[PDB]
Design a protein around this ligand. Structure first.
Ligand SMILES: OC[C@H]1O[C@H](O)[C@H](O)[C@@H]1O
Ligand SMILES: OC[C@H]1O[C@H](O)[C@H](O)[C@@H]1O
Ligand SMILES: OC[C@H]1O[C@H](O)[C@H](O)[C@@H]1O
Ligand SMILES: OC[C@H]1O[C@H](O)[C@H](O)[C@@H]1O
Ligand SMILES: [Ca+2]
Ligand SMILES: [Ca+2]
Ligand SMILES: [Ca+2]
Ligand SMILES: [Ca+2]
Lengths: 345, 335, 331, 345
């Protein structure tokens, strides 16, 4: 079993990722840290805890509320995709009202949530990094501000951190900006810092991959088949969240079926075998006026003139799923949804 | 018939574009102006004249040798490999441009030579004068700096940029834009009526297949086997690198597509939009940035270009029949 | 008395500033936080504690070791040359910060340690809590990123920048700004009440002349000759490079001037203006850009361009009196 | 006698520079080319010709109308200093009405001025560059766009061009922007191009020097003394122009006596021996948002760590006048004003 932490900004797809990571027996989630991105970090905190409560885990997994804005830029949310709440599609009154105390507070010695501070997670992560036999796994699927901040406070830990991310676009264009992907552009300095720090970094789920991991009619019916027998209430919840995500992806980006981005990065930690991988140098544009967040690589230059590479590698890039990859991913995701529905009843 | 000028950096693609434009009865080429690219503007001059001589037109069309480097950056400089050009070079007629300029020979050619000829054409035009541009766009930027009042009477039709797909020589940008993005940025702000007629979006689907090669042979081999051999080699010179570097099974032909746009616009999708050219980006200069991906109350910066993202149905076939018919007529004249 | 904290990168100048702030009865130093500069934040930690120990205060004031590098750029890293510190190091009392934090020893110090202490001070303040900042301003930028709602209740008084004269380590920019301009840019946008109290504009006219040196000796040599010797060497360590590189006959003392501003603001000219920090410039990052040159976007700082008349003398009498009291305590 | 051309944007101080250069026997002016800057290049054309006509030379010196805007930015004029015309202070009706035909037109084969084109000067300059035994001298005291354009058309001539300029600020702050000087900031890409091209370039008159070359009451009375005996009309003209320049320099920048910048660069070609000189690497800021046009040098680094210098020298910088320099300058300037007044009567 692999001990890991999740850094995320839920967000419908982060919701899916938490489910997979928390319930996969291959992963052992230590905590969740929320960031700014799809919404304000206060909402993404609340949304991680809602995800956990729905899956009967809100009193088991500590959740930390992290940094509210990027290193050197202004926050940019994405209600256009994820609603003003960050998890549109459903009424969360019941989940909010039955929310157990956050075990993070116990760890921190806090009476209540008003004491939560962005750097709360630091000491917990540092214990996990120290304890790790090789490297400690972080899955990051929102802005990567929190990890940048950690590394600024703990630079000596970078070499013992392994990042597995949903971020970027390489061989296809971006989404919220022409050539850049949301998670990078909202704080490119963060990812630029991380790449230079000594972290072992994997672009596990760029749009390149995530734009082929779509929530089709076939997926929706497999979900209902795995869940409706055990928990109609849970079916209703997860379907509505996915339909809301679909509708905005259609109205905003023309997509017929929406991409379920973030679980794919958890899937990479669960089962790396399903992914193509290439080592390269990734530069994050920070100076560009219209192109900040662009992930610019030396892949062309290796292919052209291989033995003249100036810059050393600083990342793994996953451009495609290997054969059977899409199937492997959905079976793992739908099995988790089926187990969740069992626990809920 | 449509009077026009060609600005280009031949270049095998540009060679194909000159052929189409010069031999199309729909177009009336007034001159050709060459620019820098992978090859020095001196070579691209020589290559335009080689193209013209091969097609029995070197003594009809004036060719100008333009600027050797970008507005504010460094160049990245035969330029028509695949072929022995000794015969073409040796039988080269005098460049009619020299007569117009009063020059004894070619060593007197200056980058701004084209200016007064273009200004006469712009003045004479009833609406706008058509320029087809398929290399760096430095020359046109320079012209507009010398003649700002003419921008409003210039219509540009270009091979440049990439919009819904990634770039080529840099991750998100296309060669012609990145080699001088300030040029295109200037032009877009100037009042020029500007059409991205042949971005990679379109040109990456205009590929030299087995079917194209045999149609070429069919149109050319009866009349000029030498010319068949030549045009195939030129089209396949960069084939291996296009495969191993950029994944193509069959290599693209970019620049003719922009001449095709002036010949027959009706084969192209078209959308008016605001294009920003990245100039500040370290790794992303030359990017053509639009909101085309997006389907509020946000201040819309006004349109400054037409973007052609795809060929309409039958467009690829319309293009090749026009291109291959030209190659067929050329091969007739050569024998 | 005015409660305040010092953020600094000692540094001979910062050493002088700590002395003034700690021994002035007008100021009540709550803690010192160290930052990166020409020396690593580990050394600047050690140097703040050395300053405190020398002045018989290392067991009174908590010192925090802060961030080791800028927000988004690379560091440019003893830091108090001129002196043998073996005695001071060996007699160093436990850092009271450790007691506050529950740490056994100094290896457990973390850059964000100061945060909760500062937040208590900000909350407790009736209007705003005073920070004097005289190195890179990374620590304060980090704090504000963790605690954005506190910006409105923080008053900064800094040694940083250059406005009507050129810079020092770069043509148009001053060390403290250029080493992390994103930090100061952040702070200026945050809501902090910010004063450029001691730009080069002022500090380049606060020079260690023969007259200053003899006044120092007069105030100190009667009580502590070894302290006289120490403080002169520290003040003249960088003399040769200040002459050969930057033209000064007598070298400047920058950072005390910012503590002096909190002690006695009335000696300074002041103007409210909009300051833009260059971050995009290749050769000009750290430039503090205003329209101050012109006599014909909302204000975000106070700028102090010159000392009022008698200001130089007010400053030295305060500085030299502190050195005289220190020398008394040392003997 | 030294053959040279003037590139300028008159402008009250350019007016003074033309006077000095044209009437100094040490200099042989081949032509004047006007640029954008203190005003639109059409006005600076008219203003060069007005200068020439006033000094009985409008039919002797060809004037070219050059480029109207910078290489890659939008024009910025300076009416705040120089009036909407570019030469406020005086009524120019008489000068305009008695303006002889521009000899440039004869050189170009043009019937009239509507045929003037920005690249007109090119062929004339190229003949002068070819004919020069070493290098051909250009004095440049406005935007340097025209010379950048020339070099883009004629790159092989750069090595045979010597520039002597009024531009920049090095050890003091700028004027129209905090850290940069008008002539550089209005087109920094131009100067950046020129510095990289192979031109032999001298910053002969930065603000460093020009801010100490002031039009005092002592200068004004010396002017009147040298001119009023021979031409009261000319005295009236040159005084009014200087007083207008003074008043705006006071209202705009608080200067009591205004700096007469541009003549100082002509003075450098007349008598270099009055100037300090240092060779260094000058970088022009082009990327800075608030600091474009800044002249950033490696002078600090040679002083600090001398034998590590990376970047090769690309300019001469004149930081101060040598002793007697200010006197030498005014005697030369006031003698010219005195000779002008003689010819006018
Ligand atoms: O571009 C994909 C990222 O932004 C989307 O909003 C998802 O949350 C994902 O993390
Ligand atoms: O980017 C495609 C362009 O570059 C190629 O070299 C062709 O000439 C074409 O104009
Ligand atoms: O540039 C002035 C600053 O740098 C110096 O090194 C001093 O520490 C001062 O705070
Ligand atoms: O900054 C000085 C320059 O601009 C001024 O306006 C002068 O004309 C001079 O050429
Ligand atoms: Ca997410
Ligand atoms: Ca081309
Ligand atoms: Ca300091
Ligand atoms: Ca001028």
């Amino acid at each position: 079993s692999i001990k890991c932490a999740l850094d995320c900004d839920p967000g419908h797809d982060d919701l899916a990722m938490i489910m997979l990571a928390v319930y996969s027996p291959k992963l052992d989630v230590q905590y969740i840290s929320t960031t700014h991105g799809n919404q304000t970090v206060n909402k993404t905190y609340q949304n991680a805890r809602r995800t956990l409560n729905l899956i009967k885990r809100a009193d088991k997994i500590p959740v930390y509320r992290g940094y509210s804005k990027p290193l050197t830029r202004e926050s940019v949310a994405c209600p256009e995709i994820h609603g003003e709440s960050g998890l549109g599609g459903v009424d969360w009154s019941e989940i909010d009202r039955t929310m157990p105390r956050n075990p993070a507070l116990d760890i921190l010695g806090y009476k209540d949530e008003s004491e939560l501070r962005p750097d709360d997670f630091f000491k917990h992560l540092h214990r996990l990094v120290s304890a790790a036999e090789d490297k400690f796994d972080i899955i990051s699927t929102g802005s990567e501000t929190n990890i940048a901040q950690y590394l600024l406070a703990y630079p000596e830990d970078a070499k013992k951190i392994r990042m597995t991310t949903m971020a970027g676009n390489f061989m296809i264009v971006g989404n919220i900006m022409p050539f850049a992907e949301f998670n990078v552009l909202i704080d490119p300095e963060a990812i630029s810092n991380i790449l230079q720090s000594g972290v072992d970094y994997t672009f596990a789920a760029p749009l390149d991959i995530t734009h082929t991991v779509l929530v089709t009619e076939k997926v929706i019916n497999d979900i209902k088949a795995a869940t409706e027998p055990y928990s109609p209430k849970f079916t209703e919840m997860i379907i509505k969240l996915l339909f809301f995500f679909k509708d905005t992806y259609r109205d905003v980006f023309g997509f017929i079926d929406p991409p379920l981005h973030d679980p794919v990065a958890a899937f990479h930690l669960i089962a790396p075998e399903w992914f193509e991988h290439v080592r390269c140098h990734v530069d994050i544009e920070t100076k560009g006026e219209y192109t900040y967040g662009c992930c610019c690589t030396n892949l062309i230059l290796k292919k052209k003139d291989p033995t003249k590479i100036v810059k050393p590698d600083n990342a793994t890039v996953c451009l495609k799923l290997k054969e059977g990859g899409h199937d492997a991913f959905w079976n793992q995701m739908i099995t988790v949804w089926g187990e969740i529905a069992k626990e809920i009843g």
